[PDB]
Amino acid sequence: AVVWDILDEVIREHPVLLNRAPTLHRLGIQAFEPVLIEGKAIQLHPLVCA
Amino acid sequence: EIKELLKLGDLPTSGQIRLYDGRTGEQFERPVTVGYMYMLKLNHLVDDKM
Amino acid sequence: VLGLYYMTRDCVNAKGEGMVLTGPKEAERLYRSGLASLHARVKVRITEYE
Amino acid sequence: SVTEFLKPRLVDIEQVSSTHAKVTLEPLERGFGHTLGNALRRILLSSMPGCAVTEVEIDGVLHEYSTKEGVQEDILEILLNLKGLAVRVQGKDEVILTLNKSGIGPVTAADITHDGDVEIVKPQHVICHLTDENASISMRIKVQRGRGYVPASTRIHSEEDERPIGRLLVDACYSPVERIAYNVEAARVEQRTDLDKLVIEMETNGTIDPEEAIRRAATILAEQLEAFVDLR
Amino acid sequence: GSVTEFLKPRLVDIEQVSSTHAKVTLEPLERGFGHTLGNALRRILLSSMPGCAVTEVEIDGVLHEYSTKEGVQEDILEILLNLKGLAVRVQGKDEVILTLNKSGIGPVTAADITHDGDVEIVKPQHVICHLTDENASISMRIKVQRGRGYVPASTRIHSEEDERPIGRLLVDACYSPVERIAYNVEAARVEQRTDLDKLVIEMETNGTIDPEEAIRRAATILAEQLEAFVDLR
Amino acid sequence: CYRILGLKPTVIFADQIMYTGFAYAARSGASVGIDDMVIPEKKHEIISEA
Amino acid sequence: KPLVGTGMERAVAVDSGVTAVAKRGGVVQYVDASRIVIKVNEDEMYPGEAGIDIYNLTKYTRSNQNTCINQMPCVSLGEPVERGDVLADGPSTDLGELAL
């Protein structure tokens, strides 16, 4: 459990880069603040999909 | 023929029924197409992808 | 887009047509109470800024 | 225990103003956020007791679409302003107030004839604007105690043809709640992800504070449930 | 008069169409409270009703669910799936061990389970398996425990009970006894008054909960949840 | 909004637009049924004339 | 089974050898999760023959795609069986119909 608390501490304001191939233009890679979620699927904001 | 088979089952001919939101109990403002569809699981499982 | 479009459309005769509203808050109250439809043509007091 | 549930341990109140408050409760059992929020929202919108202005008579006005000289606002805007009048009455179930004034400038709630059993929340509230020294306004307003919101279109009946000249009908905003909204977000307790956090954004007239409104709505619901509860 | 004095509902009638299907009538209800109570009670009933479910099964000669037993028509996995649907009402314990010994050709159903005095089988006809040989015998030991909600075995292993033997099989537990909840609001012409309403709640369950007890438990849960709002600063 | 008010109000506006659109699309109960594909009654005679 | 099918489900399920198809009619004499024993009809067995057909079912074997291949009986003791009848359902088969 303390490992999970540490992980919550380390990701607080640490951005991560999300990239979808093909990276046709520079919006193909964008930074997001990660919120830790259960499950194995990345959750993407609907407005960035376009 | 689909309409007649629905009529035999006492179901609406249009294929749309009045649904209620379980979160609030409120009626959805328009009738909704509710039926049965045959769905598949396509071997592209996330736990093989993560 | 569909939800905003459905929100911002008008109907010729709708529940609560012709009401005069103190502001947007009263419109929200009337809608959630079921006393008025989203498409009801009404006169609403609006404060805007420039 | 199978009969033991999670009762909120973190309660936060953010007072944006004396009338606006944001109340956040966590943690809640999965789905309890929507249940509690929607129940409270319905009770606050449609069942909260309160006092509001219902009928208005103006001397120079015969119908709601009649014009009057000396008043900047049309009669419809005056009716809206009277809808915005927050008033609380002690003991009495129905009161009638009289407003007479002459003078260039705003005609506000502070000009209404005072009654010991009636209290006005915002004297600064503007009822109309008088445009000339040769202009006078005289009106009689009716304040009743009721629940929720009853539009004037519900009360316009041929059975009420007893209405004399100029008995204008005003939407009755009995409930103090001006806006009630709720949002449900995620919460966790020891990596127990499936939990609910409830955020309640409440704005009310100055009749009662938002916290008092929430307490009264919860009291109403609990009293409704009392005949089925088998515990303390 | 008495605008602030709401009328309080009571359980006026309970109708039981079948052992699994019932209707409960609440009356009287002020305008608008019928829908509020109906939806709140529906959510609470579908989410939080206690019940008993099968959790573990031990069958002699069976090491894992991905195997077959000679003389038994069904695979062990299908036997466990059938056992997942067993409706058991336990009177005074949160866990109980049931025994099922059967021999000879024929269906093996819930009526064949050796019964404790404080265990009731709602549906004896429930088929557990089929024996297809005269020399075939089934000896089974079932663990039924009381719980709330849906607890899959994958999450159940988090209990970390050390050294579970090989022949022990875990069944996903669906403790909820309710299956379908509907509510209708009608006009209740009572007390020489016209604006009162009546709430009819129709419930289909597995037959392991008294409908009145379920309604009262839902109301109790709702009241306990509201206690935080009533007392808030 | 971006040209008049800048970046931060635009981001908040975009999030609120998304939330409102999703909520009211859900409340609308918009659905596609077989009866929504309305065929003109003039179609058959147009085909015959052609 | 698909409630809305096209009628080709039976052919796909039978022509593919995932199902145990009865090669001779008769009455099923023994059933369990792994074996089906059929007593062949008198007018259908050859001279000097035991008149019994044994079908051994595939239980929980690995597919090429690491999925499960399992055959389950769809018949019960004493039930008549004709030539071409499906005796056991294979993966994605329900009573001899393709069930994807």
CATH code at E187? 3.30.1360.10
Residues D29 and D54 in one domain: no
- Facing residues of E102 across strands? E138
Contacts of D180 in chain B (CB under 8 A): none
Residues D153 and D139 in one domain: yes
CA dihedral sign of residues D153, D158, D161, D166: positive
Rounded to 5 degrees, φ, ψ at F27 are -65, -30
Contacts of E35 in chain B (CB under 8 A): 25
Q: B2 to chain G: nearest residue by CA? A: G4
List, in sequence order, the alpha helices (H) in chain G.
9-15
Cα–Cα nearest to F28, from B31, B28, C31, B18: B28
CA D60/CA D135 separation, integer angstroms: 11
Residue E206 DSSP SS3:
coil
Contacts of B48 in chain A (CB under 8 A): none
Residues E99 and E161 in one domain: yes
Residues E59 and E121 in one domain: yes
Cα–Cα nearest to D135, from D49, D60, D44: D60
Which residues lie below 8 Å from residue B4, measured CB to CB, with a gap of 6+? Answer: none
Which residue's entry shows tokens 């909004």? F1
CA distance D1 to chain B (A): 26
CA distance G22 to chain E (A): 18
Question: What SS3 string covers D122-189?
Answer: CCCCEEEEECCCCCEEEEEEEEEEEECEECHHHHCCHHHCCCCCCEEECCEECCCEEEEEEEEEEECC
List, in sequence order, the alpha helices (H) in chain E.
33-48, 76-84, 153-156, 211-231
CA distance G31 to chain E (A): 6
Cα–Cα nearest to E29, from E205, E193, E231: E193
Please report the residues numbered 17 through 36 in chain A whose beta carbons come closer than 8 angstroms to any beta carbon of chain D: none
Residue E189 DSSP SS3:
coil
E149, E175, E201 - which closes a domain:
E175
Q: Which amino acid is at D145?
A: R
CA D107/CA D105 separation, integer angstroms: 7
Q: A47 to chain F: nearest residue by CA? A: F18
CA distance G33 to chain E (A): 5
Of D38, D148, D225, the CB nearest to E39: D38
Residues D170 and D220 in one domain: no
Residues E60 and E147 in one domain: yes
Q: Do G73 and E70 touch (CB under 8 A)?
A: no
Q: Do F28 and B28 touch (CB under 8 A)?
A: yes
> Which residues of chain B have a Cβ shorter than 8 Å from any chain E Cβ?
22, 24-25
Rounded to 5 degrees, φ, ψ at D171 are -60, 130
Strands (E), E104-148: 106-109, 113-114, 119-121, 127-131, 137-148
Domain region containing E118: 51-175
The technique by which this structure was obtained is: cryo-EM
Q: Do G4 and B43 touch (CB under 8 A)?
A: no
Residues D78 and D158 in one domain: yes
CA dihedral sign of residues G91, G96, G99, G100: positive
DSSP string, C23-47: SHHHHHHHHHHTSS-TT---EE---
CA E150/CA B20 separation, integer angstroms: 24
Residue D145 half-sphere exposure, CB side, CA atoms within 13 Å?
Answer: 17
Contacts of C32 in chain F (CB under 8 A): none
CA distance G3 to chain E (A): 23
Contacts of E229 in chain D (CB under 8 A): 36, 40, 214-215, 217-218
A5 at interface of D, judged by CB pairs closer than 8 A: no
D43: exposed, middle or buried (C-beta count within 10 Å: 0-12, 13-18, 19+)?
buried
Which residue's entry shows tokens 């023959």? G49
CA E37/CA G20 separation, integer angstroms: 55
B5 at interface of A, judged by CB pairs closer than 8 A: no
Domain G18-92 sits in CATH 2.40.50.100: yes
Residue D100 half-sphere exposure, CB side, CA atoms within 13 Å?
Answer: 2
D174, D197, D215 - which closes a domain:
D174
D136, D156, D174 - which closes a domain:
D174
Residues E132 and E24 in one domain: no
Rounded to 5 degrees, φ, ψ at G51 are 75, 25
Is E201:E44 a contact under the CB 8 Å cutoff? no
Contacts of B27 in chain E (CB under 8 A): none
CA distance G2 to chain E (A): 21
CB pairs under 8 A between A and F: 3
CA C6/CA D41 separation, integer angstroms: 24
Which residues lie below 8 Å from residue E10, measured CB to CB, with a gap of 6+? Answer: D227, E26, E27
Which residue's entry shows tokens 């459309």? C9
Q: Do C45 and D80 touch (CB under 8 A)?
A: yes
CA E228/CA E224 separation, integer angstroms: 8
CB pairs under 8 A between C and F: 25
CA D112/CA D140 separation, integer angstroms: 10
Q: Do D151 and C28 touch (CB under 8 A)?
A: no
CA distance D148 to chain C (A): 9
Contacts of G76 in chain E (CB under 8 A): 73, 130
B46 at interface of A, judged by CB pairs closer than 8 A: yes
A25 at interface of B, judged by CB pairs closer than 8 A: no
CB pairs under 8 A between A and B: 7
Given resolution (angstroms): 2.7
CA E86/CA G68 separation, integer angstroms: 27
In the DSSP assignment, the letter for residue E81 is H
F41: exposed, middle or buried (C-beta count within 10 Å: 0-12, 13-18, 19+)?
exposed
Residues D166 and D189 in one domain: no
Q: How many domains does one find in chain D?
A: 2
Residues D6 and D54 in one domain: no
Is E75:G33 a contact under the CB 8 Å cutoff? yes
Residues D164 and D121 in one domain: yes
Which residue's entry shows tokens 């103006």? D58
Residues D141 and D182 in one domain: no
Q: F23 to chain C: nearest residue by CA? A: C3
In the DSSP assignment, the letter for residue E8 is P
